[PDB]
Amino acid sequence: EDMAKIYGAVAAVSKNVNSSVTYEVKRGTHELIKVPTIPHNLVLIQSDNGK
Amino acid sequence: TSGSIINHANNLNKVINHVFADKPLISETMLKILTIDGTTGKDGYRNWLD
Numbered sequence: 001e002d003m004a005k006i007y008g009a010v011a012a013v014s015k016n017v018n019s020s021v022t023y024e025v026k027r028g029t030h031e032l033i034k035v036p037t038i039p040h041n042l043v044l045i046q047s048d049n050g051k
Numbered sequence: 052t053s054g055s056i057i058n059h060a061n062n063l064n065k066v067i068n069h070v071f072a073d074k075p076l077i078s079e080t081m082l083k084i085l086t087i088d089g090t091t092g093k094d095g096y097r098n099w100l101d
Contacts, residue, residue, distance in 0.1 A: 005076045009066045016062060 067097050 070076045071093055085095030 001074075002076055005070060009069045012065045012069050013062045016065065 063097065063100065066100070067093055070096070 075082075077096060082092040082095070085099060086092055088095075090098075
């Protein structure tokens with residue numbers, strides 16, 4: 001019985017080993033919007049007689 | 052090294068928790084000796100193992 005306790009404690013220590021890490025790489029990334037129209041900013045000014 | 056100290060501390064706590072779980076591995080006679088100063092049974096056994 002006391003041997004099972006000693007053997008169990010050793011197995012607990014051996015099981016404390018770490019395997020790996022996992023993380024997401026998202027820094028520096030931004031979403032993109034879509035502009036549907038082109039701004040021209042033009043107006044045609046014409047006289048009444050058209051000259 | 053800080054890594055060795057952290058590894059020793061964590062492993063030692065795991066052993067103490069497992070040893071004192073369910074039926075303790077250590078009889079009550081040794082606990083009386085290690086708790087004469089005033090420290091608890093878990094703490095007294097922990098320093099002796101170190």
